[PDB]
Structures are given as structure tokens and as C-alpha cells.
């Protein structure tokens, strides 16, 4: 799957 981190 694809992963996105928005700090
Ligand atoms: Zn993946």
C-alpha cells in the first residue's frame, strides 16, 4: 500500500 506522513 501507499503511505503519507503529514507532520
Ligand atoms: Zn505498501
Amino acid at each position: 500500500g501507499s503511505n503519507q506522513n503529514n507532520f
Side-chain angles (χ1 to χ4, degrees):
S2 292
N3 304 96
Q4 188 190 60
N5 298 289
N6 302 306
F7 292 94

